[PDB]
Write a protein that binds this ligand. Structure first.
Ligand code: XGP
Ligand code: MG
Length: 775
């Protein structure tokens, strides 16, 4: 219900995967749930990451230098080596007799309970790991050693600065050394990233009641403290290690900061700090669902836990960072920031708004780089990268090595230009839910005006007045180009033209409702009447391709592509969620076929809802049949293989609108339990899937739960499945708290301030602390 628990030894990617979901974090650090006794091998990967600390490596492959920006795995401060009677204690899979590890979401504490068989008996080892969310540079470890015998025990407490980035198997072909150890002085190890000039300072102190630890000279690039004690029979020995993490990216003088931090904290403080923090968090952040799924309530909180570990205002207010695709739990995609933000930003805005503002600063700070990125590709305005990191330049590869013939080929990954519209969408959602216009003033409006310049300039008017957007990719990554050409990008992706149509609407609204701010920023950005006139005509003339039946084509010419025999590919190969790689193995190109990795055209409904999207299509002068949603959903689900974890929940929310309750609960159960169950084996070995954690919470609260906040008002239209006996949670809207209790036939809502809301489309006035029930 509250504790994610594992019992028994796992191996390989299954062992890495548990480590990912057991990761503890506080916005500033991500600390992988690995055993304190192990280093990187086939069943273990210790990982420590800091928000925004990247390194660039250069690896020469095929006469070309491949530059990779890697989120740095810090020196491992948790390593412990034991010794009995000067004989080393071997802790591996052949000597561990009992193993259970887990994270208690109520207090944020990681435990690992081990029993090791040693030549003289059994060693019982229980580890508590914690992170301080207030003194967010602080970590601490509680280690308890017990033996059913007596011998001389020497404990070695190590900061291991010899490790590399080795979490992702396919990344090991590249240079994986990320820093040089510049000094080891007493409690402190200092490193400096090889190419980004970041000083990394890792300091630690190890104490106990019944032994003294002393810093000793150790192996190269390892800081070592050593203590000796005589184990009495069935007598527990308790050891505390206080760790302080600091880098020059967020601190002006990181060495002296770590020094004062070690001398002004304790493991107990960290434990109680994490304890008090989560107890306070769960007063409002919990989402209580009593249903016929016994595991469902745990994974809902697991989602809430990992999203709040990835970013929390008490730490992130001091940081220049956002939430990566894996948060801070692993090295999958090298910690880069994706458009995945769209899956967490509305959650942060609705339940913890200051953290949402913190991570939107990351994009606002990087408008300049986006403007530099637009020039580099011959574009205008601000064109945000597909993969952003330290500087905001494009960190996706431009070029890829063909594996059949050994020659370089263009890489089209960056052509998913719609990532610019997600950033703009995320500022709108935040502005709508919080009412904090100070973000728009401090870059948010400039970001919108500069990205609008990128879209408006890229647009092409035809002879009959229609505007087109070419050379782009939609969210369906399976389609990078038209059949026949090497030029990347397709034309008039429906998701892009619609999202862009929305952005011009919101821009034009801001010019009226926020005239003072608008004219100021438009003057500073040279957004004159010419640009504004272009925006108005593009908002009316963007082109879409819709068939006579009402099917909105994914992009122009999509109806001409070939069909795929999905049932044949399924029976032949098994799973088709990588049908793109199956097609390429047969010498076939996914560019030629009607198959979708994830929601593309239907992703507009996730962002805006079907009513908003229908209004946009009509605004563009197109007529849709009254049942276009079901038709388009049916059309595209039949072509979608769910190659991404974010695919199914978009269909789930649509199914709620269509009252397809069986499929809606099915797809949501599938998606929310992907990381937890891991029936395939190791899908989270490279990092937890943060986006699907926020996306499934959206299905629970905004689709099933039927709560919307982004449309200028609170809209309450719950549609619960019969198996969901009770759904309760809170929401934040412009400083007002809202509490909800929902059953399959009634909703109860209370606001701690006066609020005019809508319930099933009917206007309702809420009085402060006076709940109402709607059956
Ligand atoms: O290729 P996968 O890892 O299966 O899914 C991809 O992951 C990206 C980052 O998480 C995300 O932005 C893409 O939409 C998604 O297709
Ligand atoms: Mg030495």
């Amino acid at each position: 219900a509250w504790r994610l628990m594992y019992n028994g030894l796992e191996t390989e990617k299954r062992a890495y995967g548990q480590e990912s979901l057991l990761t503890l974090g506080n916005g500033y650090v991500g600390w992988r749930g690995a055993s304190v006794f192990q280093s990187f091998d086939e069943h273990n990967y210790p990982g420590l990451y800091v928000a925004g600390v990247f390194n660039q490596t250069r690896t020469e492959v095929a006469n070309k230098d491949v530059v990779n920006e890697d989120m740095v795995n810090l020196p491992n401060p948790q390593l412990f080596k034991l010794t009995l009677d000067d004989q080393p204690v071997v802790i591996n899979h052949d000597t561990i007799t009992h193993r259970e590890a887990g994270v208690d979401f109520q207090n944020g504490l990681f435990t690992e309970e081990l029993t090791v068989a040693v030549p003289q008996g059994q060693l019982t080892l229980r580890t508590v790991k914690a992170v301080d969310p207030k003194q967010y540079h602080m970590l601490g470890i509680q280690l308890a050693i017990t033996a059913d015998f007596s011998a001389q025990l020497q404990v070695e407490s190590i900061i291991d600065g010899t490790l590399l980035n080795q979490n992702v198997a396919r990344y090991r072909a590249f240079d994986s050394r990320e820093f040089n150890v510049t000094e080891i002085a007493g409690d402190i190890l200092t490193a400096k990233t090889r190419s980004t000039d970041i000083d990394i300072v890792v300091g630690a102190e190890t104490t106990s009641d019944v032994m003294t630890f002393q810093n000793v000279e150790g192996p190269a690039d390892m800081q070592v403290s050593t203590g000796e004690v005589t184990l009495q029979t069935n007598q527990t020995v308790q050891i505390d290690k206080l760790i302080a993490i600091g880098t020059s990216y967020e601190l002006s003088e990181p060495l002296v900061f770590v020094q004062a931090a070690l001398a002004t904290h304790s493991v107990d403080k960290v434990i109680e700090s994490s304890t008090a923090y989560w107890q306070e968090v769960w007063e409002t952040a919990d989402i209580q669902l009593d249903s016929d799924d016994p595991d469902m309530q745990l994974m809902i909180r697991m989602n809430i836990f990992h999203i709040r570990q990835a970013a929390q205002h008490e730490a992130n207010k001091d940081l220049d960072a956002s939430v990566g695709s894996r948060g801070l739990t692993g090295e999958g995609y090298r910690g880069h920031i994706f458009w995945d933000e769209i899956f967490v930003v509305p959650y942060y805005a609705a339940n913890d708004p200051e953290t949402a503002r913190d991570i939107l600063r990351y994009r606002i700070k990087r408008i300049d780089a986006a403007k530099k990125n637009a020039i580099l590709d011959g574009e205008a305005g601000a064109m945000f990268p597909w993969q952003s990191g330290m500087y905001g330049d494009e960190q996706s590869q431009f070029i890829h090595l063909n594996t059949v013939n050994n020659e370089w080929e263009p890489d089209n990954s960056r052509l998913q230009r719609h990532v610019s519209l997600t950033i703009a969408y995320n500022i709108w959602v935040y502005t709508q839910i919080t009412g904090d216009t100070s973000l728009l003033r401090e870059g948010g409006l400039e970001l919108l005006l500069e990205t609008t310049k990128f879209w408006l300039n890229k647009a092409e008017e035809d002879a009959d007045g229609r505007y087109h957007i070419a050379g782009v990719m939609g969210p369906d990554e399976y389609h990078e180009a038209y059949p026949g050409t090497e030029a990347g990008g397709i034309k008039d992706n429906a998701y892009t033209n619609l999202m862009l149509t929305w952005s011009l609407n919101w821009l034009l609204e801001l010019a009226e409702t926020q005239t003072e701010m608008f004219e100021s920023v438009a003057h500073e950005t040279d957004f004159g009447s010419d640009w504004l006139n272009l925006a108005k005509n593009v908002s009316k003339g963007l082109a879409l391709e819709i068939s006579p039946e009402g099917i909105i084509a994914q992009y122009a010419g999509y109806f001409d592509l070939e069909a795929v025999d999905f049932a044949a590919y399924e029976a032949k190969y098994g799973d088709i969620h990588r049908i793109d790689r199956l097609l390429k193995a047969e010498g076939l190109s996914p560019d030629d076929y009607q198959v979708a990795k994830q929601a593309d055209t239907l992703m507009t409904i996730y962002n805006l809802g079907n009513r908003h999207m229908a209004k946009l299509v009509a605004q563009l002068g197109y007529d849709l049949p009254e049942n276009w949603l079901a038709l388009n959903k049916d059309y595209y689900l039949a072509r979608t293989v769910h190659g991404s974890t974010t695919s199914r929940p978009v269909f789930a929310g649509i199914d709620v609108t269509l009252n397809n309750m069986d499929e809606a609960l099915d797809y949501l159960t599938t998606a929310i339990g992907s990381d937890y169950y891991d029936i395939q084996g190791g899908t989270t070995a490279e990092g937890v899937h943060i986006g699907v954690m926020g996306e499934t919470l959206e299905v629970i609260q905004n689709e099933f739960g039927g709560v919307m906040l982004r449309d200028g008002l609170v809209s309450i239209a719950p549609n619960l499945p019969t198996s969901w006996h009770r759904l309760a949670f809170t929401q934040k809207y412009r400083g007002t708290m809202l509490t909800f209790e929902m059953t399959p036939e009634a909703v109860t809502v209370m606001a701690d301030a006066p609020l005019d809301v809508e319930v099933y489309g009917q206007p309702v006035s809420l009085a402060a602390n006076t709940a109402q029930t709607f059956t």
